[PDB]
Enzyme design. Structure first.
Site, PDB file in Angstrom:
ATOM      1  N   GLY A 239      12.552  -0.339  -1.017  1.00 52.82           N
ATOM      2  CA  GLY A 239      11.962   0.863  -2.008  1.00 52.82           C
ATOM      3  C   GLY A 239      10.390   1.081  -2.770  1.00 52.82           C
ATOM      4  CB  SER A 240       8.931   3.788  -3.676  1.00 51.58           C
ATOM      5  OG  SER A 240      10.181   4.226  -4.367  1.00 51.58           O
ATOM      6  CB  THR A 241      11.233  -0.992  -6.463  1.00 52.78           C
ATOM      7  OG1 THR A 241      12.080  -0.180  -6.528  1.00 52.78           O
ATOM      8  CG2 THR A 241      10.750  -1.638  -8.009  1.00 52.78           C
TER       9      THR A 241
END
Length: 640
Positions: free
Chosen positions: A383-385
């Site tokens: 994810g964009s994490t």
């Protein structure tokens, strides 16, 4: 010499026929029934091997040190050492001997009962006595039980003491409504083929207080495996099931009467938990008095196993997922202790091990959310994490200036027209974006641009310093993380996507917590650890300490800034650094446009706990950040 080599081949084919379990084929290599030839007929040799070797579960017969000479004009003596595996262990250094017969043009074995076991004569018998070993327990870091052997309250009915007509129907509806059972399930149980009128037909295990017993209901205490956390730890711990004859053919040292771990830790540690069968394998005279003892050793119960799991954190982490699809991982990031490994939705490991119906199992196996999946061990796009890692790499190789401000106009962006219909998307339209701003708002476009500016070479150089391709030392079946399918992206689109955690990236939640632990150890990666006694392993200088002291102050703002994506967590009032993320679901997929919600969070003051939670195929207005408040309180209170 020509006949001595043919006699060796006969002994080898005989042993091979015994090892393969084809006793008929082995007996047809023996000579005729006589006094100086074979001691029994072919069909009698078959039955003696099948009875004796079948009783001790003999498997894997193999020989060595084979010597075949000559004794007479038609008699060739042979000898060899042999070993085999039985339900009581390995039978090593067995001295076999016999004689061959070379009449005709073939060579046969003068079969004797000493070819079953060495010191056997005539009508000698074989006796096997065994004591079952008790399965060891699985306990958490503070000794709380996660898998134990206990006594259960078996609810069942006796059809005779129930009634004749009308009185029998009134009690079945009474027992069905008093123990939460179907009225059809009680009748189908008492009408199966195996039932007789006076039998006790089991129904359900009562895991609490026993209500009033109607006419025909009765409780019988039985022993079996019990899982105190239930579904909350079902994927991690696993379950045990009855042992089948196929299991014994693969490993004779199991107990035909015992339980075997079918999945999870119960299966990963089946050998250490099941112990070793005790007992004695002896030879007796024709009446029942021991001649020689072949194998004997006392029963050894299974070793207990202590995990880094916290039973209270595991339960809270699972319950916080509200039955939705997702997973949560909690660690003490300085040591790698896995405090919680939650996957949701889940199954009932107690109902699974204490007899489950065909339809209840089929319900689990055909649920589209697939509760059997260990989601903490399944590779996902992070994810964009994943901005944190890309930013840390960008600060290390100097591509990213923390104070340089990119000008981003709109919500979609692409490098040029050659990307066609593909565009990098962000949720917040912020014109002036520096690194701190991009982390606060989760700006994928900022990340996509800096990744392209960094280039593939410098990007992989920073990525390779992590654990991509590495097999972690964990008793959990998992595949190593990967940056992409191949060793080159060969696509600016794929490169930009990998920048903010999409692309062909594949990292399971445990591997994520390992990678993200650098922000709690000044750039040193601390490998995760599940077994409590294991030694803390680490990997130093994964990212620079400069990058950590730059990003962690920004990750505080993701919580504290009023427009931070994790601002709902400032309600806790505890020191928190966090990062939210989203990711598109790929693959076939029954619905194309579905999203995964991620949350990373840890204490930036004490570095005592770390959390990585995800929400697969998230419903609208749902997120991993909404559900993390409870687990974060507990971890902050008990793991400083």
């Amino acid at each position: 010499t020509q006949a001595v080599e043919a006699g060796e081949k006969t002994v080898e084919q005989f042993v091979q026929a015994l090892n393969k379990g084809d006793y008929n084929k082995a007996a047809e290599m023996t000579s005729k029934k006589a006094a100086n030839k074979s001691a029994l007929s072919e069909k009698e040799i078959l039955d003696k091997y099948q009875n004796i070797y079948g009783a001790a579960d003999v498997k894997g017969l193999q020989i060595s040190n084979l010597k075949v000479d000559k004794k007479d004009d038609s008699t060739y003596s042979f000898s060899y050492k042999a070993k085999m595996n039985t339900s009581l262990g390995e039978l090593k250094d067995l001295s076999y001997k016999g004689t061959l017969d070379r009449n005709d043009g073939q060579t046969t074995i003068n079969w004797q009962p000493n070819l079953v076991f060495p010191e056997m004569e005539g009508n000698d018998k074989v006796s096997l006595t065994t004591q079952e070993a008790a399965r060891g327990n699985i306990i958490d870091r503070n000794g709380e039980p996660l898998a134990t052997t206990g006594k259960l309250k078996q609810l069942g009915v006796v059809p005779s003491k129930l009634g004749d007509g009308g009185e029998k129907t009134a009690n079945i509806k009474a027992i069905a409504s008093s123990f939460d059972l179907t009225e059809d399930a009680i009748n189908q149980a008492i009408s199966q083929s195996w039932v007789q009128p006076d039998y006790f037909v089991p129904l359900k295990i009562i895991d609490g207080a026993t209500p009033e017993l109607p006419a025909g209901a009765t409780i019988q205490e039985v022993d079996g495996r019990y899982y105190p956390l239930g579904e909350a730890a079902a994927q991690l711990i696993g379950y045990v099931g009855d042992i089948t004859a196929e299991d014994i053919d693969k490993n004779p040292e199991l107990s035909s009467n015992g339980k075997i771990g079918r999945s999870g830790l119960e299966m990963a540690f089946d050998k250490d938990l099941r112990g070793t069968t005790g007992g004695k394998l002896s030879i007796t005279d024709a009446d029942g008095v021991e001649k020689k003892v072949l194998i004997e050793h006392e029963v050894q119960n299974g070793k207990d196993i202590k995990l880094t799991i916290d039973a209270k954190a595991q339960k809270t982490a699972f319950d916080s997922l509200g039955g939705k699809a997702g997973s949560t991982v909690a660690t003490t990031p300085k040591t790698g202790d896995l405090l919680a490994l939650a996957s949701s939705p889940s199954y009932d490991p107690n109902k699974m091990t204490n007899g489950i119906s065909q339809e209840d199992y089929k319900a689990y196996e055909e649920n589209p959310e697939q509760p059997f999946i260990s989601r903490f061990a399944t590779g996902y796009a992070p994810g964009s994490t994943f901005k944190m890692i890309t930013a840390a790499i960008g600060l290390d190789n100097g591509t990213i200036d923390p104070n340089e401000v990119l000008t981003i106009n709109g919500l979609k962006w692409q490098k040029d027209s050659s990307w066609g219909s593909y565009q990098v998307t962000r949720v917040s339209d912020v014109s002036q974006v520096d690194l701190k701003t991009a982390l606060i708002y989760s700006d994928n476009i900022y990340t996509a641009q800096e990744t392209l500016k960094m280039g593939e070479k410098k990007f992989r150089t920073g990525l390779d310093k992590f654990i991509f391709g590495e097999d972690l030392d964990l008793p959990i079946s998992m595949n190593p993380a990967q940056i992409s399918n191949e060793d080159s992206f060969n696509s600016d689109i794929l490169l930009a996507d990998t920048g903010y955690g999409q692309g062909e990236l594949l990292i399971n939640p445990i591997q994520q917590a390992a990678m993200y632990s650098v922000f709690a150890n000044n750039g040193t990666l601390v490998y995760p650890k599940l077994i409590a006694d294991k030694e803390t392993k680490d990997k130093k200088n994964v990212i620079g300490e400069t990058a950590v002291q730059t990003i962690v102050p920004d990750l505080r703002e993701v919580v504290q800034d009023v427009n931070g994506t994790a601002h709902s967590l400032s309600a806790l009032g505890i020191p928190l650094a966090a990062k939210t993320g989203t990711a598109e679901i790929p693959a076939p997929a029954p619905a194309p446009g579905k999203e995964n919600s991620f949350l990373f969070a840890f204490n930036p003051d004490n570095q005592g706990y770390m959390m990585v939670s995800m929400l697969e195929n998230k419903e609208d207005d749902d997120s991993a950040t909404k559900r993390a408040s409870e687990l974060l309180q507990y971890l902050n209170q008990n793991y400083q």
